[PDB]
Amino acid sequence: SDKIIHLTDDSFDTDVLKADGAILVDFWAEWCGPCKMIAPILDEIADEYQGKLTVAKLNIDQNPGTAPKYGIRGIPTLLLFKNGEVAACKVGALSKGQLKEFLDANL
Ligand SMILES: [Cu+2]
């Protein structure tokens, strides 16, 4: 988790993320099994793509305002932002290989 950015509800000013570059945001909660399963994969991605992609997390129990702004209905939900705007999303767990495929399709 050392290379992951900790986001809060204040990180967004509407549906615009107040951060630059390509940023993959994981919406998650501790009670969510599949969320816990992808956490190590997100750590690997943050390491392998350091300097090219920022990986961030928004805990929906601690920050309950943000998910509704994006119509999020389940977790984990990954939203990929480009220059503050949503460019892609993926609901549900996936493998490391699938996450790299998803990123390649978008970046
Ligand atoms: Cu870490």
35 is catalytic: yes
Q: Technique behind this structure? A: X-ray
Burial class (CB in 10 A: 0-12, 13-18, 19+), 72: middle
For residues 60 and 41, give the distance between their C-alpha atoms in angstroms, rounded to a whole number. 19
Å from CA of 38 to ligand 1 middle: 14
Rg (CA), the chain: 12
Query: Pairing state of beta strands 22-28 and 77-82?
Result: antiparallel
Q: How far is CA 91 from CA 2, 51, 74, 100, in A?
A: 24, 25, 7, 15
Å from CA of 13 to ligand 1 middle: 27
Å from CA of 27 to ligand 1 middle: 17
Set out the domains of the chain in order of their start, with CATH numbers. Answer: 1-107 (3.40.30.10)
Give the resolution to one decimal, in Å.
Answer: 1.9
Q: Which of 35, 41, 42, 46 is catalytic?
A: 35
Q: Which of 5, 19, 29, 32 is catalytic?
A: 32
